[PDB]
Amino acid sequence: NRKRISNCVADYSVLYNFAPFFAFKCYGVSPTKLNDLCFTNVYADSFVIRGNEVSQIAPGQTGNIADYNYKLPDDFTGCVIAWNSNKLDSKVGGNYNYRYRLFRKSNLKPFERDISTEIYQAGNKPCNGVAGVNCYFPLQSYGFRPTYGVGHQPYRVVVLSFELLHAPATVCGPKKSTNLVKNKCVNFNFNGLTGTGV
């Protein structure tokens, strides 16, 4: 799945209050200074992947799932989060919604999505019609079974992207609001006014 953020503010404190995430692979900017830096646009690629493929989903690693279905560019700073939602949805006969493509003719550039209906050809013959020998439609369904260990569980993965632009930024909100005591000689910075008094 792929998404983007409009003009508002995203605090990660409520995100950190949701659940202990499995990955926390925020290899870009430091997690402490996430609220200090903010951008014009945010891409939210929140999807689900198998448990054995959480290892190679990083930009530094590649595989059949990475190079053919969804790839992340290594020359790009990113922050990804993932949690285990295997008990959220489980089917005894197998999850038939988690089919994935086996093969596409050319390797996929990072950050593109492509769906089509064509037949992979495995010989010097056209595959316009239907065939089952040396001409295969690329189809692979996992069929998630609840009676399996950690390797084949659906780990839902949220990929968060960020980039600069010539526009003012949206999601950091430096708003600093205090308690405003009523009778004391205290300092204040009301809308940038450096002053003291009672």
């Epitope: 059949n64 093969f103 040396n134 390797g151």
Partner: antibody
Framework: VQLVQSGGGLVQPGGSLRLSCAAS????????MNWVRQAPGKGLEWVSL???????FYADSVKGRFTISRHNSNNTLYLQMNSLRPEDTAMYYC????????????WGQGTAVTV | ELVLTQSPGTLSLSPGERATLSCRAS???????LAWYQQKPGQAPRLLVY???SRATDIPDRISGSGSGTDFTLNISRLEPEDFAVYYC?????????FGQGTRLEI
């Protein structure tokens, strides 16, 4: 539907050997293909995967010594062994084992590695 | 990665009988990516099943092979003299690979 391997022989450890994996009929150059070594008295064991794209999978023992490249004119694969070792005395298997069936394996050129 | 056990050391083949060859996987492993193949050393081997549901081609498919969890087996009802070769069961994840030393089929 059938494959032939050409160029094998017997060379000393520490050299480079070239082998060609060429199949007829099946356009194997755009498939998930794999490389297997089979020692005498030892069962079949996975060694390398190479895709239609540029994704290299290697075993821990072979490391980066193994080299694979695909030709575009025919269904021909050029593969190179560099700095051979006495632990690599094995018969060669080249196949196009995919995730659907992984079928139609090959007899493979039979070689032996010794000093 | 995967640990596989295939028993026994030697078979007890006699044509015209029902035989049971079982191989056991590591941790409740699935079977839609499991592949059986015949193998006789010296030449090209033969494939048996893909996906553990529909068998591969070039076989009349009288062997009933299936299983779940760590328990996988195949029962062959009618034996033929062309079956004198060792059978392997494998599982593929794309990032991890496994193999198993099969059981020799003789008398």
């Amino acid at each position: 539907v059938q494959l032939v391997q050409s160029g094998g022989g017997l060379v000393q450890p520490g050299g480079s050997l070239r082998l060609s994996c060429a199949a007829s009929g099946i356009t194997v150059s755009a498939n998930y293909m794999n490389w297997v070594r089979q020692a005498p008295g030892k069962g079949l064991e996975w060694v390398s995967l190479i895709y239609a794209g540029g994704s290299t999978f290697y075993a821990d023992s072979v490391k980066g010594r193994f080299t694979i490249s695909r030709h575009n004119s025919n269904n021909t694969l050029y593969l190179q062994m560099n700095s051979l070792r006495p632990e690599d005395t094995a018969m060669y298997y080249c196949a196009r084992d995919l995730l659907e069936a992984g079928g139609m394996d090959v007899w493979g050129q039979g070689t032996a590695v010794t000093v | 990665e995967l640990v596989l056990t295939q028993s026994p050391g030697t078979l007890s083949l006699s044509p015209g009988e029902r035989a049971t060859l079982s191989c056991r996987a590591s941790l409740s492993v699935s079977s839609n990516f499991l592949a059986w193949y015949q193998q006789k050393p010296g030449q090209a081997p033969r494939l048996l099943v893909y996906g553990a549901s529909s068998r591969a081609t070039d076989i009349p498919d009288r062997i009933s092979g299936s299983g779940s969890g760590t328990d996988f087996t195949l029962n062959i009802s009618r034996l033929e003299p062309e079956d004198f070769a060792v059978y392997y069961c494998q599982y593929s994840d794309g990032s991890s690979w496994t193999f198993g030393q099969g059981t020799r089929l003789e008398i």
